[PDB]
PDB file of all heavy atoms in Angstrom:
ATOM      1  N   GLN A  83      11.150   1.774  -0.620  1.00  0.00           N
ATOM      2  CA  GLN A  83      11.077   3.122  -0.070  1.00  0.00           C
ATOM      3  C   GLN A  83       9.642   3.632  -0.007  1.00  0.00           C
ATOM      4  O   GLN A  83       9.296   4.387   0.908  1.00  0.00           O
ATOM      5  CB  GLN A  83      11.940   4.072  -0.900  1.00  0.00           C
ATOM      6  CG  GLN A  83      13.432   3.803  -0.791  1.00  0.00           C
ATOM      7  CD  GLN A  83      14.257   4.697  -1.698  1.00  0.00           C
ATOM      8  OE1 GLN A  83      13.729   5.606  -2.340  1.00  0.00           O
ATOM      9  NE2 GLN A  83      15.558   4.441  -1.757  1.00  0.00           N
ATOM     10  N   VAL A  84       8.797   3.235  -0.961  1.00  0.00           N
ATOM     11  CA  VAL A  84       7.399   3.659  -0.939  1.00  0.00           C
ATOM     12  C   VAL A  84       6.669   2.998   0.225  1.00  0.00           C
ATOM     13  O   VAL A  84       5.858   3.634   0.909  1.00  0.00           O
ATOM     14  CB  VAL A  84       6.717   3.345  -2.286  1.00  0.00           C
ATOM     15  CG1 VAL A  84       5.206   3.611  -2.210  1.00  0.00           C
ATOM     16  CG2 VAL A  84       7.345   4.166  -3.416  1.00  0.00           C
ATOM     17  N   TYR A  85       6.948   1.715   0.466  1.00  0.00           N
ATOM     18  CA  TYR A  85       6.243   0.984   1.516  1.00  0.00           C
ATOM     19  C   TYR A  85       6.609   1.505   2.900  1.00  0.00           C
ATOM     20  O   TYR A  85       5.753   1.573   3.789  1.00  0.00           O
ATOM     21  CB  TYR A  85       6.553  -0.509   1.411  1.00  0.00           C
ATOM     22  CG  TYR A  85       5.927  -1.341   2.507  1.00  0.00           C
ATOM     23  CD1 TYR A  85       4.583  -1.681   2.463  1.00  0.00           C
ATOM     24  CD2 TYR A  85       6.682  -1.788   3.584  1.00  0.00           C
ATOM     25  CE1 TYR A  85       4.005  -2.439   3.463  1.00  0.00           C
ATOM     26  CE2 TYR A  85       6.113  -2.547   4.587  1.00  0.00           C
ATOM     27  CZ  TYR A  85       4.775  -2.870   4.522  1.00  0.00           C
ATOM     28  OH  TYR A  85       4.202  -3.626   5.517  1.00  0.00           O
ATOM     29  N   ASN A  86       7.878   1.868   3.103  1.00  0.00           N
ATOM     30  CA  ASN A  86       8.314   2.373   4.399  1.00  0.00           C
ATOM     31  C   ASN A  86       7.666   3.706   4.752  1.00  0.00           C
ATOM     32  O   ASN A  86       7.461   3.980   5.940  1.00  0.00           O
ATOM     33  CB  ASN A  86       9.836   2.522   4.415  1.00  0.00           C
ATOM     34  CG  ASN A  86      10.554   1.198   4.244  1.00  0.00           C
ATOM     35  OD1 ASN A  86      10.038   0.146   4.621  1.00  0.00           O
ATOM     36  ND2 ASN A  86      11.753   1.246   3.676  1.00  0.00           N
ATOM     37  N   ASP A  87       7.334   4.527   3.754  1.00  0.00           N
ATOM     38  CA  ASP A  87       6.783   5.857   3.987  1.00  0.00           C
ATOM     39  C   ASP A  87       5.264   5.874   4.050  1.00  0.00           C
ATOM     40  O   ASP A  87       4.698   6.574   4.897  1.00  0.00           O
ATOM     41  CB  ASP A  87       7.248   6.811   2.884  1.00  0.00           C
ATOM     42  CG  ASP A  87       8.758   6.920   2.805  1.00  0.00           C
ATOM     43  OD1 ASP A  87       9.424   6.784   3.853  1.00  0.00           O
ATOM     44  OD2 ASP A  87       9.281   7.141   1.692  1.00  0.00           O
ATOM     45  N   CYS A  88       4.590   5.113   3.183  1.00  0.00           N
ATOM     46  CA  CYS A  88       3.139   5.190   3.035  1.00  0.00           C
ATOM     47  C   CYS A  88       2.408   4.200   3.938  1.00  0.00           C
ATOM     48  O   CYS A  88       1.652   4.610   4.823  1.00  0.00           O
ATOM     49  CB  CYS A  88       2.752   4.953   1.569  1.00  0.00           C
ATOM     50  SG  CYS A  88       2.763   3.216   1.064  1.00  0.00           S
ATOM     51  N   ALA A  89       2.640   2.899   3.736  1.00  0.00           N
ATOM     52  CA  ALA A  89       1.867   1.833   4.367  1.00  0.00           C
ATOM     53  C   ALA A  89       2.650   1.101   5.454  1.00  0.00           C
ATOM     54  O   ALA A  89       2.403  -0.086   5.693  1.00  0.00           O
ATOM     55  CB  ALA A  89       1.391   0.840   3.305  1.00  0.00           C
ATOM     56  N   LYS A  90       3.585   1.786   6.121  1.00  0.00           N
ATOM     57  CA  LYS A  90       4.331   1.184   7.224  1.00  0.00           C
ATOM     58  C   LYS A  90       3.548   1.271   8.530  1.00  0.00           C
ATOM     59  O   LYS A  90       3.411   0.272   9.243  1.00  0.00           O
ATOM     60  CB  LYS A  90       5.695   1.873   7.362  1.00  0.00           C
ATOM     61  CG  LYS A  90       6.662   1.277   8.401  1.00  0.00           C
ATOM     62  CD  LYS A  90       7.101  -0.142   8.055  1.00  0.00           C
ATOM     63  CE  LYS A  90       8.160  -0.643   9.022  1.00  0.00           C
ATOM     64  NZ  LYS A  90       8.567  -2.047   8.733  1.00  0.00           N
ATOM     65  N   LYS A  91       3.027   2.455   8.853  1.00  0.00           N
ATOM     66  CA  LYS A  91       2.300   2.655  10.101  1.00  0.00           C
ATOM     67  C   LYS A  91       0.928   1.988  10.109  1.00  0.00           C
ATOM     68  O   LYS A  91       0.388   1.738  11.191  1.00  0.00           O
ATOM     69  CB  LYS A  91       2.147   4.154  10.391  1.00  0.00           C
ATOM     70  CG  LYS A  91       1.336   4.952   9.354  1.00  0.00           C
ATOM     71  CD  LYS A  91       1.294   6.450   9.677  1.00  0.00           C
ATOM     72  CE  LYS A  91       2.594   7.184   9.342  1.00  0.00           C
ATOM     73  NZ  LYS A  91       2.927   7.164   7.889  1.00  0.00           N
ATOM     74  N   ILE A  92       0.352   1.698   8.938  1.00  0.00           N
ATOM     75  CA  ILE A  92      -0.974   1.096   8.889  1.00  0.00           C
ATOM     76  C   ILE A  92      -0.966  -0.333   9.422  1.00  0.00           C
ATOM     77  O   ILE A  92      -2.005  -0.821   9.882  1.00  0.00           O
ATOM     78  CB  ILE A  92      -1.521   1.158   7.445  1.00  0.00           C
ATOM     79  CG1 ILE A  92      -3.043   0.944   7.396  1.00  0.00           C
ATOM     80  CG2 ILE A  92      -0.827   0.134   6.547  1.00  0.00           C
ATOM     81  CD1 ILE A  92      -3.863   2.118   7.902  1.00  0.00           C
ATOM     82  N   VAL A  93       0.177  -1.022   9.373  1.00  0.00           N
ATOM     83  CA  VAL A  93       0.260  -2.371   9.927  1.00  0.00           C
ATOM     84  C   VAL A  93       0.072  -2.333  11.439  1.00  0.00           C
ATOM     85  O   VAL A  93      -0.523  -3.241  12.030  1.00  0.00           O
ATOM     86  CB  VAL A  93       1.594  -3.035   9.533  1.00  0.00           C
ATOM     87  CG1 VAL A  93       1.749  -4.395  10.232  1.00  0.00           C
ATOM     88  CG2 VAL A  93       1.692  -3.190   8.009  1.00  0.00           C
ATOM     89  N   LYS A  94       0.579  -1.282  12.088  1.00  0.00           N
ATOM     90  CA  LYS A  94       0.354  -1.117  13.523  1.00  0.00           C
ATOM     91  C   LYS A  94      -1.063  -0.641  13.816  1.00  0.00           C
ATOM     92  O   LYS A  94      -1.644  -1.025  14.838  1.00  0.00           O
ATOM     93  CB  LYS A  94       1.368  -0.134  14.116  1.00  0.00           C
ATOM     94  CG  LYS A  94       2.685  -0.769  14.557  1.00  0.00           C
ATOM     95  CD  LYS A  94       3.472  -1.349  13.393  1.00  0.00           C
ATOM     96  CE  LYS A  94       4.834  -1.848  13.842  1.00  0.00           C
ATOM     97  NZ  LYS A  94       5.603  -2.460  12.725  1.00  0.00           N
ATOM     98  N   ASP A  95      -1.634   0.186  12.938  1.00  0.00           N
ATOM     99  CA  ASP A  95      -2.969   0.721  13.184  1.00  0.00           C
ATOM    100  C   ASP A  95      -4.040  -0.348  12.997  1.00  0.00           C
ATOM    101  O   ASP A  95      -5.015  -0.396  13.757  1.00  0.00           O
ATOM    102  CB  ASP A  95      -3.235   1.910  12.260  1.00  0.00           C
ATOM    103  CG  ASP A  95      -2.220   3.022  12.436  1.00  0.00           C
ATOM    104  OD1 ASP A  95      -1.291   2.857  13.254  1.00  0.00           O
ATOM    105  OD2 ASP A  95      -2.352   4.063  11.757  1.00  0.00           O
ATOM    106  N   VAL A  96      -3.876  -1.213  11.993  1.00  0.00           N
ATOM    107  CA  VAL A  96      -4.878  -2.242  11.728  1.00  0.00           C
ATOM    108  C   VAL A  96      -4.840  -3.359  12.766  1.00  0.00           C
ATOM    109  O   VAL A  96      -5.876  -3.990  13.016  1.00  0.00           O
ATOM    110  CB  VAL A  96      -4.700  -2.812  10.307  1.00  0.00           C
ATOM    111  CG1 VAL A  96      -3.455  -3.698  10.212  1.00  0.00           C
ATOM    112  CG2 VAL A  96      -5.950  -3.576   9.861  1.00  0.00           C
ATOM    113  N   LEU A  97      -3.682  -3.620  13.377  1.00  0.00           N
ATOM    114  CA  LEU A  97      -3.558  -4.614  14.436  1.00  0.00           C
ATOM    115  C   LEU A  97      -3.931  -4.076  15.810  1.00  0.00           C
ATOM    116  O   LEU A  97      -4.254  -4.870  16.700  1.00  0.00           O
ATOM    117  CB  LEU A  97      -2.124  -5.160  14.487  1.00  0.00           C
ATOM    118  CG  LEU A  97      -1.610  -5.947  13.278  1.00  0.00           C
ATOM    119  CD1 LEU A  97      -0.119  -6.215  13.433  1.00  0.00           C
ATOM    120  CD2 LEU A  97      -2.371  -7.256  13.094  1.00  0.00           C
ATOM    121  N   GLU A  98      -3.899  -2.758  16.013  1.00  0.00           N
ATOM    122  CA  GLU A  98      -4.276  -2.178  17.295  1.00  0.00           C
ATOM    123  C   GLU A  98      -5.765  -2.316  17.594  1.00  0.00           C
ATOM    124  O   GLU A  98      -6.141  -2.300  18.771  1.00  0.00           O
ATOM    125  CB  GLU A  98      -3.880  -0.699  17.334  1.00  0.00           C
ATOM    126  CG  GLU A  98      -3.960  -0.055  18.712  1.00  0.00           C
ATOM    127  CD  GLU A  98      -3.422   1.364  18.726  1.00  0.00           C
ATOM    128  OE1 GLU A  98      -3.055   1.873  17.646  1.00  0.00           O
ATOM    129  OE2 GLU A  98      -3.367   1.969  19.817  1.00  0.00           O
ATOM    130  N   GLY A  99      -6.608  -2.456  16.569  1.00  0.00           N
ATOM    131  CA  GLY A  99      -8.048  -2.584  16.720  1.00  0.00           C
ATOM    132  C   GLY A  99      -8.850  -1.845  15.670  1.00  0.00           C
ATOM    133  O   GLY A  99     -10.010  -2.205  15.428  1.00  0.00           O
ATOM    134  N   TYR A 100      -8.273  -0.826  15.033  1.00  0.00           N
ATOM    135  CA  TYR A 100      -8.957  -0.062  14.005  1.00  0.00           C
ATOM    136  C   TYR A 100      -8.877  -0.797  12.668  1.00  0.00           C
ATOM    137  O   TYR A 100      -8.220  -1.834  12.536  1.00  0.00           O
ATOM    138  CB  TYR A 100      -8.352   1.337  13.890  1.00  0.00           C
ATOM    139  CG  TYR A 100      -8.289   2.094  15.198  1.00  0.00           C
ATOM    140  CD1 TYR A 100      -7.149   2.057  15.989  1.00  0.00           C
ATOM    141  CD2 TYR A 100      -9.367   2.851  15.638  1.00  0.00           C
ATOM    142  CE1 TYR A 100      -7.085   2.747  17.184  1.00  0.00           C
ATOM    143  CE2 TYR A 100      -9.312   3.546  16.830  1.00  0.00           C
ATOM    144  CZ  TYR A 100      -8.169   3.490  17.600  1.00  0.00           C
ATOM    145  OH  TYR A 100      -8.107   4.180  18.788  1.00  0.00           O
ATOM    146  N   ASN A 101      -9.558  -0.244  11.666  1.00  0.00           N
ATOM    147  CA  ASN A 101      -9.549  -0.743  10.298  1.00  0.00           C
ATOM    148  C   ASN A 101      -8.640   0.128   9.441  1.00  0.00           C
ATOM    149  O   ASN A 101      -8.309   1.258   9.811  1.00  0.00           O
ATOM    150  CB  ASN A 101     -10.966  -0.759   9.714  1.00  0.00           C
ATOM    151  CG  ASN A 101     -11.919  -1.620  10.517  1.00  0.00           C
ATOM    152  OD1 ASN A 101     -11.498  -2.492  11.276  1.00  0.00           O
ATOM    153  ND2 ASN A 101     -13.213  -1.378  10.351  1.00  0.00           N
ATOM    154  N   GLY A 102      -8.231  -0.415   8.306  1.00  0.00           N
ATOM    155  CA  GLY A 102      -7.356   0.298   7.387  1.00  0.00           C
ATOM    156  C   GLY A 102      -7.555  -0.178   5.967  1.00  0.00           C
ATOM    157  O   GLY A 102      -7.872  -1.344   5.730  1.00  0.00           O
ATOM    158  N   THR A 103      -7.373   0.744   5.020  1.00  0.00           N
ATOM    159  CA  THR A 103      -7.574   0.474   3.599  1.00  0.00           C
ATOM    160  C   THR A 103      -6.517   1.226   2.807  1.00  0.00           C
ATOM    161  O   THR A 103      -6.241   2.395   3.097  1.00  0.00           O
ATOM    162  CB  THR A 103      -8.975   0.898   3.142  1.00  0.00           C
ATOM    163  OG1 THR A 103      -9.181   2.279   3.463  1.00  0.00           O
ATOM    164  CG2 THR A 103     -10.056   0.054   3.815  1.00  0.00           C
ATOM    165  N   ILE A 104      -5.928   0.552   1.820  1.00  0.00           N
ATOM    166  CA  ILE A 104      -4.934   1.131   0.918  1.00  0.00           C
ATOM    167  C   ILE A 104      -5.400   0.820  -0.498  1.00  0.00           C
ATOM    168  O   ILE A 104      -5.425  -0.347  -0.908  1.00  0.00           O
ATOM    169  CB  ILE A 104      -3.519   0.582   1.173  1.00  0.00           C
ATOM    170  CG1 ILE A 104      -3.152   0.709   2.662  1.00  0.00           C
ATOM    171  CG2 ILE A 104      -2.476   1.300   0.284  1.00  0.00           C
ATOM    172  CD1 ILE A 104      -3.349  -0.568   3.459  1.00  0.00           C
ATOM    173  N   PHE A 105      -5.776   1.862  -1.241  1.00  0.00           N
ATOM    174  CA  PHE A 105      -6.185   1.740  -2.633  1.00  0.00           C
ATOM    175  C   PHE A 105      -5.668   2.940  -3.411  1.00  0.00           C
ATOM    176  O   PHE A 105      -5.498   4.029  -2.857  1.00  0.00           O
ATOM    177  CB  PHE A 105      -7.714   1.631  -2.762  1.00  0.00           C
ATOM    178  CG  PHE A 105      -8.445   2.926  -2.536  1.00  0.00           C
ATOM    179  CD1 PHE A 105      -8.992   3.618  -3.603  1.00  0.00           C
ATOM    180  CD2 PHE A 105      -8.608   3.437  -1.258  1.00  0.00           C
ATOM    181  CE1 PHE A 105      -9.676   4.803  -3.404  1.00  0.00           C
ATOM    182  CE2 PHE A 105      -9.289   4.624  -1.055  1.00  0.00           C
ATOM    183  CZ  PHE A 105      -9.825   5.306  -2.128  1.00  0.00           C
ATOM    184  N   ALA A 106      -5.423   2.722  -4.704  1.00  0.00           N
ATOM    185  CA  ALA A 106      -4.766   3.684  -5.581  1.00  0.00           C
ATOM    186  C   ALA A 106      -5.716   4.136  -6.679  1.00  0.00           C
ATOM    187  O   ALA A 106      -6.603   3.382  -7.097  1.00  0.00           O
ATOM    188  CB  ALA A 106      -3.508   3.081  -6.212  1.00  0.00           C
ATOM    189  N   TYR A 107      -5.520   5.369  -7.137  1.00  0.00           N
ATOM    190  CA  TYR A 107      -6.249   5.965  -8.248  1.00  0.00           C
ATOM    191  C   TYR A 107      -5.264   6.445  -9.306  1.00  0.00           C
ATOM    192  O   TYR A 107      -4.186   6.958  -8.996  1.00  0.00           O
ATOM    193  CB  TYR A 107      -7.120   7.133  -7.764  1.00  0.00           C
ATOM    194  CG  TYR A 107      -7.875   7.845  -8.865  1.00  0.00           C
ATOM    195  CD1 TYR A 107      -9.037   7.304  -9.400  1.00  0.00           C
ATOM    196  CD2 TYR A 107      -7.426   9.058  -9.371  1.00  0.00           C
ATOM    197  CE1 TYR A 107      -9.731   7.952 -10.405  1.00  0.00           C
ATOM    198  CE2 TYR A 107      -8.113   9.713 -10.377  1.00  0.00           C
ATOM    199  CZ  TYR A 107      -9.264   9.154 -10.890  1.00  0.00           C
ATOM    200  OH  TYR A 107      -9.952   9.801 -11.892  1.00  0.00           O
ATOM    201  N   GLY A 108      -5.642   6.270 -10.558  1.00  0.00           N
ATOM    202  CA  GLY A 108      -4.806   6.677 -11.669  1.00  0.00           C
ATOM    203  C   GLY A 108      -5.286   6.064 -12.966  1.00  0.00           C
ATOM    204  O   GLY A 108      -5.997   5.060 -12.995  1.00  0.00           O
ATOM    205  N   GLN A 109      -4.877   6.688 -14.066  1.00  0.00           N
ATOM    206  CA  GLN A 109      -5.272   6.259 -15.402  1.00  0.00           C
ATOM    207  C   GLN A 109      -4.363   5.109 -15.838  1.00  0.00           C
ATOM    208  O   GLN A 109      -3.538   4.611 -15.066  1.00  0.00           O
ATOM    209  CB  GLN A 109      -5.240   7.450 -16.365  1.00  0.00           C
ATOM    210  CG  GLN A 109      -6.304   8.524 -16.087  1.00  0.00           C
ATOM    211  CD  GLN A 109      -5.942   9.494 -14.967  1.00  0.00           C
ATOM    212  OE1 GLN A 109      -4.800   9.546 -14.510  1.00  0.00           O
ATOM    213  NE2 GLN A 109      -6.926  10.265 -14.519  1.00  0.00           N
ATOM    214  N   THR A 110      -4.522   4.657 -17.081  1.00  0.00           N
ATOM    215  CA  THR A 110      -3.714   3.563 -17.608  1.00  0.00           C
ATOM    216  C   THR A 110      -2.241   3.952 -17.675  1.00  0.00           C
ATOM    217  O   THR A 110      -1.897   5.111 -17.919  1.00  0.00           O
ATOM    218  CB  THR A 110      -4.214   3.142 -18.998  1.00  0.00           C
ATOM    219  OG1 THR A 110      -3.454   2.018 -19.459  1.00  0.00           O
ATOM    220  CG2 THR A 110      -4.109   4.282 -20.039  1.00  0.00           C
ATOM    221  N   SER A 111      -1.373   2.966 -17.443  1.00  0.00           N
ATOM    222  CA  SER A 111       0.080   3.137 -17.445  1.00  0.00           C
ATOM    223  C   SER A 111       0.554   4.140 -16.394  1.00  0.00           C
ATOM    224  O   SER A 111       1.600   4.773 -16.575  1.00  0.00           O
ATOM    225  CB  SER A 111       0.590   3.553 -18.831  1.00  0.00           C
ATOM    226  OG  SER A 111       0.148   2.649 -19.827  1.00  0.00           O
ATOM    227  N   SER A 112      -0.191   4.291 -15.295  1.00  0.00           N
ATOM    228  CA  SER A 112       0.203   5.181 -14.209  1.00  0.00           C
ATOM    229  C   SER A 112       1.114   4.503 -13.192  1.00  0.00           C
ATOM    230  O   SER A 112       1.833   5.204 -12.472  1.00  0.00           O
ATOM    231  CB  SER A 112      -1.039   5.721 -13.501  1.00  0.00           C
ATOM    232  OG  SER A 112      -1.816   4.669 -12.959  1.00  0.00           O
ATOM    233  N   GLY A 113       1.086   3.170 -13.107  1.00  0.00           N
ATOM    234  CA  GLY A 113       1.953   2.412 -12.222  1.00  0.00           C
ATOM    235  C   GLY A 113       1.239   1.906 -10.989  1.00  0.00           C
ATOM    236  O   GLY A 113       1.795   1.932  -9.887  1.00  0.00           O
ATOM    237  N   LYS A 114       0.003   1.437 -11.163  1.00  0.00           N
ATOM    238  CA  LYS A 114      -0.795   0.908 -10.063  1.00  0.00           C
ATOM    239  C   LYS A 114      -0.493  -0.558  -9.785  1.00  0.00           C
ATOM    240  O   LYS A 114      -0.220  -0.925  -8.637  1.00  0.00           O
ATOM    241  CB  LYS A 114      -2.283   1.083 -10.367  1.00  0.00           C
ATOM    242  CG  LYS A 114      -2.724   2.543 -10.390  1.00  0.00           C
ATOM    243  CD  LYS A 114      -4.220   2.719 -10.671  1.00  0.00           C
ATOM    244  CE  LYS A 114      -4.645   2.255 -12.066  1.00  0.00           C
ATOM    245  NZ  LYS A 114      -3.853   2.852 -13.179  1.00  0.00           N
ATOM    246  N   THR A 115      -0.535  -1.405 -10.816  1.00  0.00           N
ATOM    247  CA  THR A 115      -0.241  -2.820 -10.624  1.00  0.00           C
ATOM    248  C   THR A 115       1.215  -3.038 -10.235  1.00  0.00           C
ATOM    249  O   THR A 115       1.521  -3.957  -9.469  1.00  0.00           O
ATOM    250  CB  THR A 115      -0.573  -3.603 -11.895  1.00  0.00           C
ATOM    251  OG1 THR A 115      -1.897  -3.272 -12.332  1.00  0.00           O
ATOM    252  CG2 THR A 115      -0.485  -5.108 -11.651  1.00  0.00           C
ATOM    253  N   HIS A 116       2.124  -2.204 -10.747  1.00  0.00           N
ATOM    254  CA  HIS A 116       3.519  -2.289 -10.333  1.00  0.00           C
ATOM    255  C   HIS A 116       3.695  -1.881  -8.875  1.00  0.00           C
ATOM    256  O   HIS A 116       4.607  -2.375  -8.201  1.00  0.00           O
ATOM    257  CB  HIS A 116       4.386  -1.416 -11.240  1.00  0.00           C
ATOM    258  CG  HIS A 116       5.839  -1.421 -10.875  1.00  0.00           C
ATOM    259  ND1 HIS A 116       6.423  -0.418 -10.132  1.00  0.00           N
ATOM    260  CD2 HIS A 116       6.824  -2.309 -11.149  1.00  0.00           C
ATOM    261  CE1 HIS A 116       7.705  -0.685  -9.967  1.00  0.00           C
ATOM    262  NE2 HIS A 116       7.975  -1.828 -10.573  1.00  0.00           N
ATOM    263  N   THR A 117       2.838  -0.990  -8.370  1.00  0.00           N
ATOM    264  CA  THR A 117       2.947  -0.535  -6.989  1.00  0.00           C
ATOM    265  C   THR A 117       2.428  -1.580  -6.008  1.00  0.00           C
ATOM    266  O   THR A 117       3.137  -1.950  -5.065  1.00  0.00           O
ATOM    267  CB  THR A 117       2.186   0.783  -6.816  1.00  0.00           C
ATOM    268  OG1 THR A 117       2.767   1.790  -7.655  1.00  0.00           O
ATOM    269  CG2 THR A 117       2.233   1.254  -5.369  1.00  0.00           C
ATOM    270  N   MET A 118       1.206  -2.071  -6.214  1.00  0.00           N
ATOM    271  CA  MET A 118       0.598  -3.043  -5.311  1.00  0.00           C
ATOM    272  C   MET A 118       1.081  -4.465  -5.569  1.00  0.00           C
ATOM    273  O   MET A 118       1.635  -5.100  -4.667  1.00  0.00           O
ATOM    274  CB  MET A 118      -0.932  -2.989  -5.422  1.00  0.00           C
ATOM    275  CG  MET A 118      -1.578  -1.852  -4.639  1.00  0.00           C
ATOM    276  SD  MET A 118      -1.235  -0.220  -5.325  1.00  0.00           S
ATOM    277  CE  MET A 118      -2.410  -0.167  -6.675  1.00  0.00           C
ATOM    278  N   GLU A 119       0.888  -4.981  -6.784  1.00  0.00           N
ATOM    279  CA  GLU A 119       1.301  -6.344  -7.112  1.00  0.00           C
ATOM    280  C   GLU A 119       2.795  -6.415  -7.422  1.00  0.00           C
ATOM    281  O   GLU A 119       3.551  -7.084  -6.710  1.00  0.00           O
ATOM    282  CB  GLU A 119       0.489  -6.879  -8.299  1.00  0.00           C
ATOM    283  CG  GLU A 119      -0.884  -7.442  -7.937  1.00  0.00           C
ATOM    284  CD  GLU A 119      -1.877  -6.373  -7.525  1.00  0.00           C
ATOM    285  OE1 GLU A 119      -1.486  -5.191  -7.447  1.00  0.00           O
ATOM    286  OE2 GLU A 119      -3.053  -6.716  -7.283  1.00  0.00           O
ATOM    287  N   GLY A 120       3.232  -5.723  -8.471  1.00  0.00           N
ATOM    288  CA  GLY A 120       4.622  -5.811  -8.882  1.00  0.00           C
ATOM    289  C   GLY A 120       4.958  -7.201  -9.380  1.00  0.00           C
ATOM    290  O   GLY A 120       4.159  -7.852 -10.064  1.00  0.00           O
ATOM    291  N   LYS A 121       6.164  -7.656  -9.039  1.00  0.00           N
ATOM    292  CA  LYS A 121       6.628  -9.015  -9.300  1.00  0.00           C
ATOM    293  C   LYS A 121       6.932  -9.672  -7.960  1.00  0.00           C
ATOM    294  O   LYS A 121       7.772  -9.182  -7.198  1.00  0.00           O
ATOM    295  CB  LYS A 121       7.853  -9.026 -10.219  1.00  0.00           C
ATOM    296  CG  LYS A 121       8.979  -8.060  -9.857  1.00  0.00           C
ATOM    297  CD  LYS A 121      10.112  -8.167 -10.869  1.00  0.00           C
ATOM    298  CE  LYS A 121      11.242  -7.198 -10.563  1.00  0.00           C
ATOM    299  NZ  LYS A 121      12.326  -7.265 -11.581  1.00  0.00           N
ATOM    300  N   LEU A 122       6.242 -10.778  -7.678  1.00  0.00           N
ATOM    301  CA  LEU A 122       6.269 -11.364  -6.343  1.00  0.00           C
ATOM    302  C   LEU A 122       7.536 -12.174  -6.099  1.00  0.00           C
ATOM    303  O   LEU A 122       8.066 -12.177  -4.983  1.00  0.00           O
ATOM    304  CB  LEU A 122       5.025 -12.235  -6.142  1.00  0.00           C
ATOM    305  CG  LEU A 122       4.863 -13.014  -4.834  1.00  0.00           C
ATOM    306  CD1 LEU A 122       4.998 -12.104  -3.628  1.00  0.00           C
ATOM    307  CD2 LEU A 122       3.515 -13.712  -4.821  1.00  0.00           C
ATOM    308  N   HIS A 123       8.035 -12.867  -7.122  1.00  0.00           N
ATOM    309  CA  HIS A 123       9.187 -13.744  -6.956  1.00  0.00           C
ATOM    310  C   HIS A 123      10.487 -12.995  -6.683  1.00  0.00           C
ATOM    311  O   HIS A 123      11.425 -13.604  -6.160  1.00  0.00           O
ATOM    312  CB  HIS A 123       9.355 -14.624  -8.197  1.00  0.00           C
ATOM    313  CG  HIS A 123       8.189 -15.524  -8.461  1.00  0.00           C
ATOM    314  ND1 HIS A 123       7.004 -15.070  -9.001  1.00  0.00           N
ATOM    315  CD2 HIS A 123       8.021 -16.852  -8.252  1.00  0.00           C
ATOM    316  CE1 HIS A 123       6.160 -16.079  -9.117  1.00  0.00           C
ATOM    317  NE2 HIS A 123       6.753 -17.171  -8.669  1.00  0.00           N
TER     318      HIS A 123
END
């Protein structure tokens, strides 16, 4: 649900010709690695 709302349209914007960047800010145990990396398998 987070990916569909936040970083869904950027896939179209970065392929259209423009650039795009997605980076997170937060302190320890805020849920950054779980958001970007998570569990891949």
Side-chain angles (χ1 to χ4, degrees):
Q83 292 176 6
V84 172
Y85 177 78
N86 297 331
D87 301 329
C88 79
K90 185 64 174 178
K91 62 183 76 63
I92 197 73
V93 174
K94 273 65 174 178
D95 302 2
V96 72
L97 296 171
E98 192 174 4
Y100 307 93
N101 301 340
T103 56
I104 308 98
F105 74 106
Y107 178 79
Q109 292 81 12
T110 183
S111 306
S112 60
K114 293 181 295 307
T115 310
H116 179 261
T117 298
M118 280 69 80
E119 277 71 356
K121 48 181 179 182
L122 177 53
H123 299 76

